[PDB]
Amino acid sequence: ADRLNDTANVKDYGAIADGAYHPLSERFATLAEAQAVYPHATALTDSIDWAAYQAAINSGAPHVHAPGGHYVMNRGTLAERDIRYTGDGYATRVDFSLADGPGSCMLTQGELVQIGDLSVSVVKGARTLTFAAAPDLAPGDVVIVYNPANGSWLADRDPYRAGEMWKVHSVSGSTVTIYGNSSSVYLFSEVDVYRMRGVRVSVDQMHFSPSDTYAIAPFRVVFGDGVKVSNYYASDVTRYTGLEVERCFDVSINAVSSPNRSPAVNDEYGITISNCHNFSVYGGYAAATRHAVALGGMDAVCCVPNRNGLIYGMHIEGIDIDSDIGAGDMHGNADKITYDNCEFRNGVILQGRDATVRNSTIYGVSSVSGEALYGTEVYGGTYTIENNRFISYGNGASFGIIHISPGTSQREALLIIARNNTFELPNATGSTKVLFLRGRNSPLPCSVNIDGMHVHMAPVAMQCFLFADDQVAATLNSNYLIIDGVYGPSGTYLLYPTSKNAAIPTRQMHQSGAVNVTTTASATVAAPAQTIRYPYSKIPNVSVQVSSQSGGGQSAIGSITPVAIAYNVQPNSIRPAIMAPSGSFAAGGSARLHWSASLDDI
Amino acid sequence: RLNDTANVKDYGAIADGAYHPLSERFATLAEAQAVYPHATALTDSIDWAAYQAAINSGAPHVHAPGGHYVMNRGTLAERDIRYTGDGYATRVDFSLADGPGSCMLTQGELVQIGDLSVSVVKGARTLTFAAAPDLAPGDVVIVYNPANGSWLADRDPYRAGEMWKVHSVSGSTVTIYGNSSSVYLFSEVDVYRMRGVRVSVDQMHFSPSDTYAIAPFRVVFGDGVKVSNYYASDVTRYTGLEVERCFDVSINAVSSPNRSPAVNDEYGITISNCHNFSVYGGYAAATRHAVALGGMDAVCCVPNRNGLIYGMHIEGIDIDSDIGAGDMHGNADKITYDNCEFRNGVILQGRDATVRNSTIYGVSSVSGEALYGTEVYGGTYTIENNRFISYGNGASFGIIHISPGTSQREALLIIARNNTFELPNATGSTKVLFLRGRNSPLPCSVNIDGMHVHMAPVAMQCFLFADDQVAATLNSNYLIIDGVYGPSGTYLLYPTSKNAAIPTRQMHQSGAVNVTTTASATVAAPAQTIRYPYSKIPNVSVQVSSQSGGGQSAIGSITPVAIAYNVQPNSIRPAIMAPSGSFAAGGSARLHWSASLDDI
Amino acid sequence: RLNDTANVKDYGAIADGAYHPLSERFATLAEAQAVYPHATALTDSIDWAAYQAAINSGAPHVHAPGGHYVMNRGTLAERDIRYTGDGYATRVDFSLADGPGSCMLTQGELVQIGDLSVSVVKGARTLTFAAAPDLAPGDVVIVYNPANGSWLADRDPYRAGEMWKVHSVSGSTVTIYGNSSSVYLFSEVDVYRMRGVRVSVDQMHFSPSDTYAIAPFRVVFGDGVKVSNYYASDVTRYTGLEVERCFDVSINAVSSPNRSPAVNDEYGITISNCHNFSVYGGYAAATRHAVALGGMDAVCCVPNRNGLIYGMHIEGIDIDSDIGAGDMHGNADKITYDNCEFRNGVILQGRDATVRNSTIYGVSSVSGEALYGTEVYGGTYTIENNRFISYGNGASFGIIHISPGTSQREALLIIARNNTFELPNATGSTKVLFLRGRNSPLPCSVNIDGMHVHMAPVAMQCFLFADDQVAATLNSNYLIIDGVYGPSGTYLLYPTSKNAAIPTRQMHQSGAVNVTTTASATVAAPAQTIRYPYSKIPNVSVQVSSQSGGGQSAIGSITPVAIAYNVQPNSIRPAIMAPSGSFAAGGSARLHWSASLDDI
Ligand SMILES: [Ca+2]
Ligand SMILES: [Ca+2]
Ligand SMILES: [Ca+2]
Ligand SMILES: [Ca+2]
Ligand SMILES: [Ca+2]
Ligand SMILES: [Ca+2]
Ligand code: NA
Ligand code: NA
Ligand code: NA
Ligand code: NA
Ligand code: NA
Ligand code: NA
Ligand code: NA
Ligand code: NA
Ligand code: NA
Ligand code: NA
């Protein structure tokens, strides 16, 4: 920068910003005259507000301030360097309604360039990269490995491609020390390697409205490193999205208010994070037709998964539509994304690998089923669902309240961890399934650990706490199904048994009871069948014992030493009994028959 | 205006910490008014006159450079506005102001619209009006029940109602973002449109009126309100900050202490009748409530709802009528504290109240209640992953004490999972979780799973105490008490006539004891203590092995038949019997036992 | 002051990334000093001279517009101050500065006051002085024990003490916000008053001295410190940011990487002897500790206390002496990490240390320890709702490894509830949680509940290993191991002579096996494997049913009597006996069993 100023105020550069379109023709008779002031002008139709804005950026000033006003922009702006954008709050409205075509937005874009190849394959947990020749990298650069094969992350969509970003600590010869560690295997002959020298971009106290005609965010950062978004507003988001960051590293978004209100067609996102690493979204209010927070991807080099994302302390709202979908998104190109301490009105999506939601209030979508947590684009790894309060008005019948359904694209074993959750299901029926695991010709094991599943307001026996099958295959491939720490209506199966899950090892909650009996003149005195509140999927492991009715001292019953046995054991009932060693009891004696049950295959 | 930023000093402020009346500068009121037309009296301060002049320019951004502004009148803005200062050095001091509006007030728009024609059900995602409504996308629509106590009877201004942002309107049908928490009968509610103001404050320090109880910075009918890097001092009467009847409010990095006498309020920051609010990343301190969640008495004084308070350091002081530093008045629905520190105490009231992930101290009362609530609507009270520390005895009030009354409107469920309790002064009267209905009209049920008591020096009364203070019995669907640890002799549930009929699930326990046979038909082991006694006779098992665990069948010539010879809530005698005849004296065995309750 | 915003370029800075000595502008030192009285030599840089001149103006707000400021001296401010820049483009570079104070320093006031007359107890909420104290509301009062190692003996500067904000003073009694974590004997402590500076920094980039180990931006004796949108680069020696002996510190959206050789420290950001601090919303990276929680050696170098680190991405690198990226030195009390990513490793040390809701990787050592601590005071170490991933073997050091020594001051309780452990390189020597006292003087007790091991390829050594490396026995009140899942053959607790006497509670297990009778008095099933072996003989039940579950009583002419024929820690033989005589061969039954331990 041989720049003349450090802060550029857009109005000093000629902006009118009175909410009307003012072409350069209002001020200049010819294009040549206009270009003598604004060399970047291409036509006299170009708006004065745009010409001024781009002039301010072209000054080189690190800080570009747009004072209060309604800037009517019929072209996008471009910055390719570190920049801090500010306004006066909601009063600074930057409106791209009239802009059309690629780049119809406030775009800031860093540098991405392909570098030399690796000579050593990256393993999971690796903390160095080794190159065939000394790499063109310096401390602080971001290095990206990228697998250009379609679907190399997940086959569900071609742009779901594998790869990863790391910040560079140091370089020694041909070995690069990276911060963090590798989530995945990257074979050296399969991946291309890039260097990202990202731009540091900040936005604060500004309000944007997007193009009416072209689906693009009104403020967009590409190849950012150290991106800061605060106190950011959108309005008239009538097509696509209010904000997007793409192929960025180290992104912090807080106190945003960026609602989408577009027709439900293909996207409809409040804010959009695309192919980013080390991002945080907190302290704000997100709203949309479909996804208030959208975690997606685009189709370009280094379109690697969203990874290492923390979305927390957010109010996340959507609306009822025909094809109901959760307001908190996660597209399948996701790894190590965690929602924590959020409200979802309504619904959350867990997809990709290593997906987590904790400490949240989560509503079922307004479908017949009322699924509150849904995912199909499932890579595998661990899906963690902990300390949430779920509320649904649906029936959980065709799709579960939690519904996780991997398909042929699954790449690793899946483990679903669901611990200490509450489920408020006032419209539950005998078909309701609280957690529904449904493989769709899944190729690898899918296993479940439920521990702490408290169902509130259910008016009748439900189908089950857990439903587990494969819709296509003859059996579900799984290592275990654990169902523990449940509460709900009597008659609700722990696991609904089918031929598809009968072979899978299972652990099912311990249950117990006792019943008073009066003896008959019989060798065996069996209680009537005692109901098991939450039926097992198969005959449980049981105990039975005898005491007095009161718990006072008692040994013999009449002249008989009573021998406790399990006379009948069903998945849903038990008949404890006592037998005489020889002969028969006398009629009229008294006892209490105790029983317990569990399954513990793992 | 020429400038979209108005700097208060550029409008004449002195801001040197002294009172400068306009009479210092102008000989007559007319002369003053020729410069400041808003001036009313020559006593009005120059700092105030400048500040209102700045706002009156219409500038979206009003900046008060460093200085001590001595304001003896309040300021008013009724539009979107961004306020800034230079940090703690920008001190806007309303000490000398008295009367209504003795503050920096920013206020939006609220107007009544037409009535609904369809009752709103729980979970509803549209509203239907009798005629096409005067709403546009982005407006906030508020339903309001003007009947006193229509949320909770405890206080007349605890009225029912709800705010939603408008997505779209088709005919008479409005599509709302989010969903309805409640039933709203169309003949019982009024409907309002709120077109709120976007208000920001950053890098400013306020001091309130000395005489009139009003926050020094107040936003009413805000939408998209942003507060950061905000300080208060000399908060000697009421509060340091208030937002009222706002939607979408974000408060971070605040340092707004209260230090007023304990009388009627004493709030660090105050959130009154707001929806979709967040408070994080800050330090809150007060005499009573460092963070206060309250309400006022005006139209659309609906419950605080959908609130997230997280990552906060929340401090109070010891007072005579001890009360938690983290407040929740009864006009609260779906308020969640997460990852906070409370030195000392939190309150859970209203409906669907939550605290998770927090370090929570007992107040400095005899009882040392750490979590308390009485103005209880119902729904689910969730208490998870906390570490509680109390120096009290938990006797009259529990360490967790939840006590709904006649005002309860829905069944209550208390969920207390994976909590730790550090109770170095526990006694034989200590109750860890005390559910006490006060003539409650509806069921109150409990699920405790994971309750680890540390440092208790003696047997406590119980992990759970559950009763109704007035009624003959407690109305409840279940009491579950599982995953506990504490001193031996502590009841899982303390049994009384008031709770005897309630279905209960109680932690599995077990043991074993070696015995030597006597020349008897029955050989009963000594009484084995049940560490955490049950509320009634448990469901039991008994078995027999060798003492070593090596192979053993017959004992002498006798096939031993395991039985439960006696069972108490606090002990058991497992035994073995001979099928006929007697054992010989001197045989050896080990008798095993287990116990649980599982009514639900 | 003539100025409220001072712009450093208006005060003369060039800031073009080159060193410009004052000699470029002034022929003589007399002329330089006439403009810049603070100039000491003509070699002093123009950028530095301008920056110090801007601070010396008294302006509350000092703005450094975009530029690369080449500072060959440090700056000093001793008052409330707001620093701003234009973002990453404002680069304040102290590379060329050397010696003490080679940084942007802002420092408040600390003075010794009068002594206490009453010892402070745990939970105390007032302080009583021998004479009326020199304190006012809002001040911070600090008690300090100057004896070396008075917090932990491990290091001399780990001294006891505490900070509180003053609410009010009545005679000689001070009312404090919050409460006392500790006992402070009045004869052992000195008392100080801290009148801290309110300091803010936003939108700035720093680089440190090349030669002297000091943060480039440093606050000492701050109160209400605010850091946001802060960057560092070329952190080649020590750290990018440090706050020291501050109260109420909020740090968000920082990007401050360290990249120094692994020698003695290597910290991204550093918090030293602070209270009521929060770090959130950012990205921290370093050679050793991305977030460093340490201390210095000076008066009032009290423990870090009441700290919340949340929603952070925390990264380190592989080094020879692997160490966790999320630090906690032993001088820590009530520090909580929540909802963070650790690539790789976290440390829990001091007292009352917590990590929840986090994704935690094992460091790149042979053992792959993910959570480590040895400078252990005691209290409660809470580990909840985490997902651990390690590529190590957990053999010499556990995945979680907590190892108090002789310096331990209070009983230790480790609470590990609902964690998941991904251990693809686990072996028969792997220990998930390893408690290892090193001649510990006080009890160390464990509650594991919910420990789910994923990807382990073989039986591990144990879920819990607990011993003392030095003493003949481990001093402990209890070891609870519940809610586990992992490979078959993995011990719940690995038994040794050192832990054999400790009360234990171990997960309930069960099974069943079909048998066909022989012509025998006793029909025993073969040994049934217990998936997770107990540390000693479990408490068992056994029963008999039909194989189908259909009705069955007698087996031929025999009433079957269930017994525990053999019980080992790792297997069981349920059996049935005839009361007299023998079964006939060829009858059918199903023998059920269960097991648990519940000493506590
Ligand atoms: Ca669209
Ligand atoms: Ca629908
Ligand atoms: Ca008051
Ligand atoms: Ca008190
Ligand atoms: Ca160093
Ligand atoms: Ca290493
Ligand atoms: Na022309
Ligand atoms: Na119910
Ligand atoms: Na008004
Ligand atoms: Na209108
Ligand atoms: Na309208
Ligand atoms: Na009232
Ligand atoms: Na009405
Ligand atoms: Na034998
Ligand atoms: Na040092
Ligand atoms: Na028996």
Residue numbers in the entry:
A (entry chain C): 145 to 746
B (entry chain A), C (entry chain B): 147 to 746
What did the authors write?
Bacteriophage-encoded depolymerases are highly specific enzymes, acting at the first step of phage infection and serve for specific recognition of host cell receptor, as well as for the degradation of polysaccharides. The polysaccharide-degrading enzymes are primarily virion-associated proteins like tail fibers, tailspikes, base plate or neck, whereas some are soluble proteins, released during bacterial lysis. These enzymes target structural polysaccharides (LPS, capsular polysaccharides, peptidoglycan) and essential components of the biofilm matrix.
An equivalent fragment of gp61 of phage phi297 (residues 1–142, named gp61d) was cloned, expressed, purified and crystallized. As expected, the structure of gp49d could be easily solved by molecular replacement with phi297 gp61d as a search model. Gp49d and gp61d display 32% amino acid sequence identity and can be superimposed with a root mean squared deviation of 1.6 Å between 572 (or 97%) equivalent C-alpha atoms. The main chain traces of the two proteins are virtually identical except for a small extra loop in the C-terminal domain of gp61 (residues 693–697). Several N-terminal residues are disordered in both structures: 168–180 in gp49d and 142–146 in gp61d.
